[PDB]
Swiss-Prot record:
Function: Allows the phage to evade the CRISPR/Cas system type I-F.
GO biological process assignments: symbiont-mediated suppression of host adaptive immune response; symbiont-mediated suppression of host CRISPR-cas system
Top-rank lineage group of the source organism: Viruses
Organismal lineage: Viruses, Duplodnaviria, Heunggongvirae, Uroviricota, Caudoviricetes
Keywords from the UniProt entry: CRISPR-cas system evasion by virus, Host-virus interaction, Inhibition of host adaptive immune response by virus, Viral immunoevasion
Name this polypeptide is given: Anti-CRISPR protein 30
Entry annotated with the keyword Ribosomal protein: no
Length: 92
């Protein structure tokens, strides 16, 4: 088991996993698009990648906010949430 996986298993909260990763990473790279991501590469060629947008604040009375929630969900969760999202939009 490589370093990135051990960090992800032992430090489930992003802030703690970040401390572990930054202590030993040989590279740190940013992905700017989408949620934004920070990539920590380790000596064993594993990589821990952390999302920069892991929360969403939805105003249920605002169509754009609801649509933004839907877009921010991954595809599988969006399918699970689709009928609720439709209910929300119809109520606006
Ligand atoms: Ca995500």
């Amino acid at each position: 088991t490589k370093t990135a996986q051990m960090i992800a298993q032992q430090h489930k909260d992003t802030v703690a996993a970040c401390e572990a990763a930054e202590a030993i990473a040989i590279a740190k790279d940013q992905v700017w698009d989408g949620e934004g991501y920070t990539k920590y590469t380790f000596d064993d060629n594993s990589v821990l990648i952390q999302s920069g947008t892991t929360q969403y604040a939805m105003d249920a009375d605002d169509a754009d906010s609801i649509k933004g929630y839907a877009d921010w969900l991954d595809d599988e969760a969006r399918s699970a949430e689709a009928s609720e999202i439709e209910r929300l939009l119809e109520s606006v």
